[model samples]
Target chain A: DIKWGMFLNTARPPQFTERRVLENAKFYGQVAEEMGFESAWMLEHHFTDYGLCGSPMVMASYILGATRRIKVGTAINILPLEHPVRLAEQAALLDQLSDGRFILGIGRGFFDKDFTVFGVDIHDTRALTHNYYDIMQEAWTKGVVGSDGPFLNFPPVPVNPRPYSDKMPMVCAAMSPSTIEWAAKNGLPMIMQHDIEHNEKASNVELYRALAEEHGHDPDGIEHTIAMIVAVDPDRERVREECRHYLNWFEDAVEKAQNWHLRKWREAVIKGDTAISKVVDNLLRLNAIGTPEDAIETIQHVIDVTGVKRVVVGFEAIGDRDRVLESMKLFDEQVRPHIRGA
Target chain B: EDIKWGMFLNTARPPQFTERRVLENAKFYGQVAEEMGFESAWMLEHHFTDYGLCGSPMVMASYILGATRRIKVGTAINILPLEHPVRLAEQAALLDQLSDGRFILGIGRGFFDKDFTVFGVDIHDTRALTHNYYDIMQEAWTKGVVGSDGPFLNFPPVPVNPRPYSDKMPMVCAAMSPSTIEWAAKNGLPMIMQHDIEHNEKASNVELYRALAEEHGHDPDGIEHTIAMIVAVDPDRERVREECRHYLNWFEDAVEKAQNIIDIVREHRKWREAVGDTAISKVVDNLLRLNAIGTPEDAIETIQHVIDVTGVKRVVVGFEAIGDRDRVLESMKLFDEQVRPHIRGAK
Candidate 1:
């Protein structure tokens, strides 16, 4: 049976207060756990109108505590921008807190505003990103070792309370061709941003396979996954409407990507008599706006093309809680089996 | 001096790690601290340790600015030597830009050797590294032209990425050493310290700082001097003692476990060796006499003594030790309900 999971796009244009977000997140995580979902995932965006979940690990910890058996993973915790030791400590602690049910997925974040705001060097991303991944894994596996490399050093002390699992499972959020190759060369599992259809995603998976094959990585033993916008509801009109709102949300996000937060765009979109067409157009281009049936077909095509073993769907432009759940049910009952067969 | 008080939320607590709650708490505390009439709220950059949870203080602070109306939130000395100055400049400017000039950059050479190592920084040269790094950071903020190839950092002439909220954002350098204090005075920035009157080290450091400020042709009052104390106050004396011991033991055990005792001993050998002895009892008694720990009246007396003796412009009481959520809330209530009134003499 193909294992399907749900990723909560917590940053859906409108920002929810801490209390509201925490309560709803706990509720949704429990619901996912109770539904026999294999895993629950979250995304990270910072100081932007795109979505509010700046620190996904904090929310993930609460979700891990509130649920059982549902492995909590961030779709891709941005690595290059974060301190590796901090990430390692959090991953290990959460893994221990969740009783070895933590899946660490990392990405070199995409948004320029995130980098601009945080003062991260976008130019040095290639070296910093690859090194950050190595540092995280090494911090977990070998404790701490003295590394005089691109961006780090050590005093040869092990990171205490290392994860209960000997080796924490790692997934590289590979969207770019080079990153995917790096992930493959490192023997790390790959989590594509959209699917191999995006040149970056395709080359990453291909590079992963080639590297895996070259290094004698058995295709059967590895877990190849992708994170996609998956909306599953039979109501085509409602799906379109939800997707429209979601796409609108993303369009606003892309337009205001450099602004760092959504307060301005929200005020403009909600109060000002402005149309959301620009948002809709931008999201369509980003491949974010689609119906449930359309989502299912796109996802299956990606799996067929990439030969992914697992498909993780994130509900961004979800209409309502019930609809999100229903879409998840649709994915479980209808699309999951088809994708598994592919 | 109009007493401007601020609390440190030190967001990045447990139950919110690597996830959204971390961000949510940042926003929540920003609003909460603003509501509480705190002049400023600060976040500390702690990595691999449970004590200081914020790894991205500027990011967390920026989120706070959007959530709150007025409170100034800054990093409590963001370990500048360990970070890329350009990146640090970007984050500081971004925060300043977002907060509408409510941002303050607190720079410090981190005290922990382990942190420096794990973050891939050389611990041996942190002092010099921090000094030079601060020079570059100030230049990056103001001159918009940086030309230097130092032992720790290197950057060419680059315009300050995003200009700050003001002509220059207020920079606070946290230090105790005479050299650092002198540097702070020369730079025309504030200085932050953790004080214990009985320890004599804090008293001497403050005196030295003031002296250095005067020597550097800066008025003593012009150099902002802030001090922090780990304090817990309750009405019941025995209960108070137990709370103090609980926190003290936690700190002691942490020091021992992390092998930080060596550093403590090096700094205060007499004090470290005095633990569990008559000397410690005297020290504990002196701590109660000098710091805020006991009844409201007792705390008021201690506060007056600290201010009178040290002339500290700002006093911060570390209030995050209460492990239980209810207890933490109660502690805050005690501060607002009982302590604040006494300190302000509003009662």
Candidate 2:
């Protein structure tokens, strides 16, 4: 079955007030639930408007309380930046409060500034992330967790409020090939981003299935939740125009100093080259942009090629609250029905 | 003036209950409080316990804020010793902004050994840790940048984003010890005191807090002093006492155990043994005298006397009859309908 999700970043410019940004997040989360979205995912970021949410768990818990039916999730909690046991307890408590409607999607964050501010070494993130994940998994299963590892050390204490379900669903946000392999080997669902190339996403999915099988897990059990930028409108030109600005803003807001991928893309855009528009067009092709028919075709193609059953679409336009809500309404009314069974 | 009423949650835990049930009870009670015109609802932070299930009060605060409108939510006391001050500051700021400035950060120096040990913090150093963490939090909130050269955390100046909605959000310190009282007063913050102490002792502590505030060149009247006490209200006195007895005994035992851990009392015993058999009834009576536990008329008089004696404008009432949801809800309704009007009229 095709599972639909709304990925909300509440992304705003640097000048926008934090109160407005958070208010928008809460409003949009309500909208997603009202519009019959199955799940809503929030983002976690620090020191930037690439996303304003610093505490996705807190926000997710709030959203969970605000919405009755929709499952609330974090697109990626920066695992290495948190104390694993505290994170475990908070996540479990939220899961319990939401009546098992919580999904913990974790990743080793790539922001250097976040690491610097948190006093964590980015070089140690991979091992730390794995260690934290293991600790959380053990804590959830055994109701007690302890670690004598580099990052955390705790005596085995009874962790209260275990996940509502025995197997609380966990997903990993995979960007690098090694991370994708690791996630698959662990038999975890994967959340992929839209910035990467379509062929790369397909190969990653392929690699994931093969790794899952090798690791004695059912390949079909793993879900590839692909996140794509979406802006659905009847006027195709207007949709593309809005999407182009979103793409430009996203590229502009990313920390190009440390992000080599963004740096290269940004340099091309700054040089007034066709490479930028070509990249934008490629992204639009890979995403659910344009009218209902266009979104349906693009989403169906994504599902067919990548075998991804779940799609978390980011509403491309930000700053304009009504437009964002309208885009979501259009996506629900115009696009969802056509791709209902895809 | 009308005394601002608040609800407190130690979060009752029945032997056979799901985590969902406990959280649902909290939400339900919070909604009821909001509807009944309570000023705020406070949740306690605890670890490794069936006693208090709220390990992350910030998460609870966020949920309660979302679950209600116009009713402020706060942590009764977030254990500052076990948390990173920067992270706490950021989360508190986020909640403050999200709730549109309806978040109060109530902090404490945790006394539980198990929590300190599990969090890898030395119990003996809780005071220092709390002080340092609180200093860092205040600096971060006020300046939007903090460089801590403290023993617990050493960091260069880093920007703290999403500053609080207000110039500075209201902060309350849970104070039992003299040092904490002094610290709170010196910092010009409100203080939340417990009901277990003698009435005169509680008054003296409040006086000390105010005197210290005055000495620090801060206006003593500006400080909002709040006292937390066990409360239950029903028309039948016997029913109220009987329904609240087991839970009150449980709470008394927990308090004695905590006090013993902090070495506040040398002789550590259960509530009955410590107070004696006859003294148990006297203990309940003493609790009744200190708290608002009785018929609605009795509770109203008790609360009025408490406010009169303590000179406190705010009260955080703990409903000890939370083991039975229906009883607790009914008690809250009784308090709202019968006790509140009388108190407001007296004011």
Candidate 3:
């Protein structure tokens, strides 16, 4: 069956308190679980308004404590910024305590301030991420981890307490082309980022499936989830307006926090003339957003084109949390049935 | 708040329970503390043993905070030297924000040799390491951007945010020895002292801390110091004593067993000796001191005397030393109903 989920960006609006963001997040986790969403994914970024969670493990624990059946996950815990064994121990504890309802999503990272503040060079993240995962993977699977690599140095120490299950689920978040291929080649399932065209997204999935097969991994065995920026309302224009304003702010926040060298292109997306911005238009064109009918069509189209059945929706584009909650309720009650109707 | 009271949550495993069961108990007790109107709930952080099931106290604190309302959650001591201070700094601030200023970040340089040996940091350097890293964390919280050049770490400037919810989040330190006391006092941070010390000794340390705090230009009266008391309350004094005796002996054995897991020498041995940390009977004896193991009437008198002598505004009672759920509950019930009213409203 096709699955549904929600992304908790934990965004701090200009005048909103961090406490309010968290209380809403805690409430939303429970509401989403009750809404029958399969999972709730949290994003990790440090010291910024763009994202509030720097410790996704702690966030995962909060969500798990709040809900009973819903799977709790990190969208991408940046591997380069922390000790791998510490991460492993935390993941294992959450896995055990949550009775295996925890999901670990990781990435190499791109936020320049995250690296600069942690005192790591941005260029070293690729190697550091690769090495750190090796350490963590060994820690979980073999019960002990160590690294003699250039980035981390620790002795082979047992990570405790052990996970509830013999094996736990960990997936990758791939944005850049190389990371996409890297994830596919490693037989790791991917969580696709929002805002690429259907043709491009479909091609990315096809490339991913083809690479998995070529690498002796079953293409269908690893499940993939697609991320979408959502704005739902009966008034399609109102949804569009909210989406444009929120995405404009989001894009600028990303541009400010990042040093990924795509500024000119992003500025165009932000600056281009439209009733809504080009960035918002691109998202609306690509994602499950707008009226109930519109969201249903978009979600069904995504399932048809990519064959990825799981969708995790983001509602941070709309600043009104009551509106966000209402959108979640309406999408579940109104839009979900049509997509799952067949 | 007069004298604020907290429950010290020990996540240690006894022969009666498993690690998972220990965690379940912690969750139930955390909520119970809130429902009973305990001012706060605290968690312990340890690794690689039955000594403590919580490797990540911040995560545990988050769970407890999520599950309960109006009860502040804190780490009695999340070991400092074993962590990357920058990472710890961000997590603490985020937790503070999430709890709406109700989370406490209490830090210490851990004495467990295995924790250091396995994490690849030498035990001898931990004092300097803790002091150095704490400075960086302080700078990060206040300045929102920080760089450090100290005895242990030299890193370039980086941002630490959500900039903390307040200019000063409720941060404290765990101090037992003279050096840690001096450092904590100099920084104007309050301290978390365990329940096993004599009131005389505690008063002197409290005195020294106040004098040092004043010399450092901090208002000693405004800084609140907290201490833990190993407690067991019952209608019968002998029953309380016997229950404490049975449980604390096992707890003491766990500590010794954990310490015996690794054999160390030199500086480690010196630190161990300097603290005069010994075996089962000494610990159980200290914990049972000052008429602490007694009836509700005995507890009020004992606790009031301890409070008057210590001159500290906060006391965290260790009810988990009783080990069983019903007994701990009954004891907490008795303490809240029969003990608190008399002492809390005292002269």
Candidate 4:
């Protein structure tokens, strides 16, 4: 049997205070490190209370410096708004600091709130993101570069202390098949966000595989990591209840409270609103929740359909320590062995 | 006296050619110093000119805060007359929070006439504006009260979120005139004095500052006093001189083109042409006499003299004029390894 690993979804923007956010991040990082997890990935959101880590590099540096072996990653950093030079330099530095344990995940951010907050135009995101990726890769691989582009202009300048890894194992967090293809052509890995079975049934996996083949890649070399919301327990109904609450809280915070940057939910939510039922419903349907056996089956089903090597499970119900711990234990004991040993 | 080191960022420079390099280099060196256990890295705010690129210290401080940990970052002197205290309070408070409670607030009155012209501020109202802004900043930081019927930048006080880390951020007044020094001492805040002679000529303004501080019943040693000096060190003094000439000439030409050169630069530049090899050598000699440069041992001796003479814990060496990256890097490395070690716990 192979070892199963889990990641804590601690990137939720703190509704309480900045101090709380920092304290939670520090505490969660330590816990994740001690639990023998493969990596700890933090998602990014801007200008919302649900997510506050606009500068993931700064937060990551503290974690990378603190942790022993647990890999630190930005589940996805918005690529377009950032200057590629700054992004690449920071990533390279963190990679070195973490002793080659940094996972670079890139995504063109979707939220308009984030765009306006950072003063980035949403329309320009696509072209800027594409350019940022290309420039970052080139700068990381080569020391000095001169770019005479409309968006990014630079004289020949050297980026010092380049990344330790030759390729840096960049992962493209693509929500659509077209983005997946772009990831494949660029020789980057694709991380599947939704449940793998749903994505495969929707033909997303086939599209990625076809693109990989078209790009003359073996397809097997392409690593597919699927992050799913999961929780497990001995008491099946009890697990379901916890999962429901978890999904509900997260959906409310992320969508309803408009706490996208981890802003205060009390202030963020519409003053008259009593509950976020729609958000709860959406989250429940999206995630996989049940006892350990059920979670294992659901995970196995995803792998079978998408042919993914890694399954990154997270609790949408963040900061509920007991449920999170139980979920991780279940995955480690039951599901991880089957997936990796397959 | 507690030793504090802060970076003074000049506000004008070639945006494209020099800024990226300077910011990157400054950050790297600042990070190094922090890692080596330095107190703080500070920057300055200058306006509408090519002498420095840091017109906005808050923006630069945010970048610096992200790049380094444990190093207290601040502006050496954020010119107050041209700003509204509310915005300044918010930005500084945000930075202070972002840096995990590491910000030193530095305030100053308008220095250059050109700066006031660019910002459309009146030089005559500088003192009043500065004093009012300082009052507003204090209230804005503490009571969330901001509005003031001041000579400049009027606003009504309202409650603002995200309180600063301290009850109030440590304020340091950058004083050029003797009256300003007395004001800073009276206010019971740390002082960063830019009066060149007060720093270089030794024991002059220090005595004056001490007398005023004592008259106010302030511990002369308790209040922090810092001085800024230009420093460049190379094994070959001749090569150093050559590089210094390139920098000085560059400064002179740049100043000539610009309408608003600081009084210090204006005075220095007029005599700059006459400052040939011999005169430059003599300047260096005076700098050495003023505790500016030479060997690491000589530098330390000068530093000791300045500290002993002035009772100031911190001396900010302006290595900004040293255009050569390798030379600057080497000098810092030498200072870190040699000079800093000898002065370790030397209070």
Task: Return the top candidate by TM-score.
Answer: 2
Superposed by TM-score, candidate 3 places the C-alpha of residue B233 at a distance from the truth, in angstroms, of 2.9
TM-score of chain B of each: 0.82, 0.89, 0.92, 0.83
Candidate 3: deviation at residue B85, Å? 3.0
DockQ of each: 0.08, 0.40, 0.40, 0.04
Off by over 4 Å in 3: A13-24, A121-127, A141-151, A175-188, A200-221, A259-281, B149-151, B235-243, B257-279, B345-347
Tens digit per residue, CA lDDT, model 3, B1-347: 26788887777777787767777777788878888888888988886667777788888887777666698887888899988888888888877776677898999999888788666688999889999888888888888887776667666676776667766978779898888898999998899887777888888898999888888898988888888887788888887887788778877766765565444222135785477345667767677875456888888888887778777777788887666788888988888889887775223
Residues A116-233, candidate 1, lDDT per residue (tens digit)? 5445787777788778777777877775534667566544445534666878876777666676667767778877665234555566666778777787666556787776676666
Better of 1 and 2 by TM-score: 2
Q: Residue B203: error of model 4 in Å? A: 9.8
Give me candidate 4's TM-score against the actual structure: 0.62
Cα RMSD for candidates in order:
10.4, 4.5, 5.0, 9.5
**DockQ: the better of candidates 1 and 3:** 3
| Model 4 lDDT per residue over B159-276, tens place | 4334566666776887767887788777677777652364444467667777888899888777767766655556665665566556655555565544434343334347956654
Q: Which ten residues in a row have the lowest lDDT in candidate 4 chain A?
A: A1-10
Per-residue error (Å), model 4, residue B43: 11
Interface RMSD of each: 10.1, 4.2, 3.5, 9.9
Instruction: Tell me the deviation in Å of residue B178 in model 3.
Output: 2.5
